[PDB]
């Protein structure tokens, strides 16, 4: 089958700037090339058909060029809501083949995380388990470290972390860290602590609660 290679897996830019993603076909597909946009958790949205024609409703900021093998999608006046994955596809020869996709990344200034800690709810304690949750919201860059302490001693088991994609409004990142223990173990100790370490951190961000 025809291979549609998207050389760059990511494309970094700033809001208001213009970005260009390239897509090269292994064989001549003329202008039978389409571009798609997929935002997280959503179905793909068709942007371009016939290599250069926009689908109805697609803003004029999305332009496509190329004929034969080399094709390029260009996004002018890039918005924070433009954060998505962009695929190229050929429909000149069957089977139809998609590109590997290019993720749009937005650059911005650094930002410290806002850290909030939450003890296990009374509803969960009636279930036998206990989950302590720490939110680290609206920080940049995405690299961050979280350390859980139980009565001043570091705890590593039972910690599950999850990172959001870049926020579609301010291009920052967020992370949730959940420490899950049994209700008996959660009641064997008193002080619970999550420590956030970031590039902006001159000292760890420590949020704690006392059972």
């Amino acid at each position: 089958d025809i291979v549609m290679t998207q050389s760059q897996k990511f494309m970094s830019t700033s809001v208001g700037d213009r970005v260009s993603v390239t897509c090269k076909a292994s064989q001549n597909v003329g202008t039978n090339v389409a571009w798609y946009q997929q935002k997280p958790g959503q179905s793909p949205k068709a942007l371009i058909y016939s290599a250069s024609y926009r689908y109805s409703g697609v803003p004029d900021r999305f332009t496509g060029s190329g004929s034969g093998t080399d094709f390029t999608l260009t996004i002018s006046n890039v918005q924070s809501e433009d954060l998505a994955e962009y695929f190229c596809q050929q429909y000149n020869n069957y089977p139809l083949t998609f590109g590997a996709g290019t993720k749009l990344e937005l650059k911005r200034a650094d930002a410290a995380p806002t850290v909030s800690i939450f003890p296990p709810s009374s509803e969960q304690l009636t279930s036998g388990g206990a989950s302590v949750v720490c939110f680290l919201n609206n920080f940049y860059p995405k690299d961050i470290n979280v350390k859980w302490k139980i009565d001043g001693s570091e705890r590593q088991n039972g910690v599950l972390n999850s990172w959001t994609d870049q926020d579609s409004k301010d291009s920052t990142y967020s992370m949730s860290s959940t420490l899950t223990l049994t209700k008996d173990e959660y009641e064997r100790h008193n002080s619970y602590t999550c420590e956030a370490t970031h590039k902006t951190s001159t000292s760890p961000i420590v949020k704690s609660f006392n059972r």
Partner: protein, 214 residues
């Protein structure tokens, strides 16, 4: 309006078969090709095939020749895709889509996508726990713990609260998913006004509205 209705999720045992439906409404079912796209978690898109509902003419991709079988029911304007002998490679999201050119504009229409999870584990509804704090802003949370399979939809105040929300991707642990969601509102909003975490798990027919009570 033109719509394509797919179910949210489908849980299927390894080796069994499932039929993903795509009910079309608002247009002439037999006038446009019905395309099918598979997307595995984290990976991109791949084309399965297309079928014209007028005469059930098909165009398959060889990778899914013996795996995917496309049919249509014209009495109900519904397109079906049959997947056989399911392995872990078939655990993905499956979209149905059409493209309509009316002589003036070209519009694409996609179903929501059916998340097919081929596994031997059992359905489990989520436990929705509130996260309330013990400044001019206040951060609330919602813990959606121990459900299977994907996905769940989380909203705040039935979608009326959309700014300041962070919904975190689910993490899998021992065949059970768990995610969380935070929301930041003015201190004049909470606890003076109700803030509710609405969780929906269509795989288990679960809809839980958990209020954040101080």
């Amino acid at each position: 309006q033109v719509q394509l209705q797919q179910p949210g999720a489908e849980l299927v045992k390894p080796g069994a078969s499932v039929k993903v439906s795509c009910k079309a409404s608002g247009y002439t079912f037999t006038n446009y090709w019905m395309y099918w796209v598979k997307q595995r978690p984290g990976q991109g898109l791949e084309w399965i095939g297309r079928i014209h509902p007028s005469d059930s003419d098909t165009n398959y991709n060889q990778k899914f020749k013996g795996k995917a079988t496309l049919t249509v029911d014209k009495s109900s304007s519904t397109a079906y895709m049959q997947l056989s002998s399911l392995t872990s490679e078939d655990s993905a999201v499956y979209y149905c889509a059409i493209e309509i050119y009316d002589g003036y504009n070209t519009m694409d229409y996609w179903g929501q996508g059916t998340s097919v999870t081929v596994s031997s584990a059992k359905t489990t509804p989520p436990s929705v726990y509130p996260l309330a704090p013990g400044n001019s802003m206040v951060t609330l949370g919602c813990l959606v713990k121990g459900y299977f399979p994907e996905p769940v939809t989380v909203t705040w105040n039935s979608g009326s609260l959309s700014s300041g929300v962070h919904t975190f991707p689910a993490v899998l642990q021992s065949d059970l998913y768990t995610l969380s969601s935070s929301v930041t509102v003015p201190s004049s909003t909470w606890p003076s006004q109700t803030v509710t975490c609405n969780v929906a798990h269509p795989a288990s027919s679960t809809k839980v509205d958990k209020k954040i009570v101080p």
